[PDB]
Amino acid sequence: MLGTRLKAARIRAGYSQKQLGMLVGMDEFSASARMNQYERERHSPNMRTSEQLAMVLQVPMAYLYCPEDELAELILKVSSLTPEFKKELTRFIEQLLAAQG
Amino acid sequence: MLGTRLKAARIRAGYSQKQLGMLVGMDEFSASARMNQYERERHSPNMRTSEQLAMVLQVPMAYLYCPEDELAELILKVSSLTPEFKKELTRFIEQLLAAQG
């Protein structure tokens, strides 16, 4: 998991390294430590843990695995769209892919 | 890594389990085997390997880690957009996020 994305997702949610750490079942005393290893990428969270982080952070798992800065930003935006707006988006994108390019 | 996404990305690119397997430096005799384990999720490709798969498959790493079917489909579409169209997209999305919802 990309540390930057994990850190960026923790800041947006307003969680301290310890808070996020405990929100996923970590031991208090080492919570903030375990998290730092992840955000430093010194440690890699397995799929199970990744799903927990995404749910808590309220961000798509894909975001935490999106190295492309532009795309990631888009992945968070499209996700924050309401069902009604999400429909308008796809409609517009399809139209463009149809002009094609 | 989500198997379905890995398999779906291999089919779209037109690669056989062995081809994809070797395209990332695997031993011929076990290439197709190693890949099946990944697509079955019986084996998890580390970040390094994930980057190799994404590059070869020509799909954003995020896609291979996008459990939400709707989003994934969108992640592939937006990625297939030309720089000129990619600008139009963001412009439209921003406008919507501004109506806000």
Author numbering:
A (entry chain A), B (entry chain A): 1 to 101
Give passages from the manuscript.
Here we identified a novel transcription factor BswR, which is involved in the regulation of P. aeruginosa swarming motility and biofilm formation. No discernible motifs were found in both proteins, but bioinformatics analysis suggested that PA2780, comprising 114 amino acid residues, possesses a potential xenobiotic response element (XRE)-type DNA-binding domain at its N-terminus. Cumulatively, these results indicate that BswR positively regulates the transcriptional expression of the small RNA rsmZ by specifically binding to the promoter region of rsmZ. Further structural analyses suggest BswR functions as a homodimer, which uses positively charged helix to fit the major groove of the dsDNA for binding.
The crystal structure of BswR was determined and refined to 2.3 Å resolution. While 101 residues were visible in the final model, the last 13 residues and the 6×His-tag in C-terminus were not well ordered in the electron density map and thus excluded. The overall topology of BswR monomer contains seven helices, of which five form a compact helix bundle and the other two assemble as extended C-terminal helices. Consistent with the prediction, our structure reveals that the N-terminus of BswR comprises α2-turn-α3, a typical helix-turn-helix (HTH) motif for DNA-binding (in which α2 is for stabilization and α3 for recognition). Based on the gel filtration profile during protein purification, we found that BswR exists as a dimer in solution. This was further confirmed from the crystal structure: the two monomers with the V-shaped arrangement of the C-terminal helices intertwine together to form a homodimer by crystallographic symmetry. On dimerization, an average interface area of 1438.7 Å2 was buried, accounting for 20.8% of the solvent-exposed surface area (6923.4 Å2) of each monomer. Furthermore, dimerization was mainly mediated through hydrophobic interaction, which involves the residues Leu71, Leu74, Leu81, Phe85, Leu89, Thr90, Ile93, Leu97 and Ala99. In the dimeric structure, BswR exhibits an uncommon large area of dimer interface, which is formed by the extension of C-terminal helical region (helices 5–7, residues 61–101). In particular, BswR shares the most similar structure to C protein Csp231I, with a root-mean-square deviation (rmsd) of 1.169 Å for the main chain.
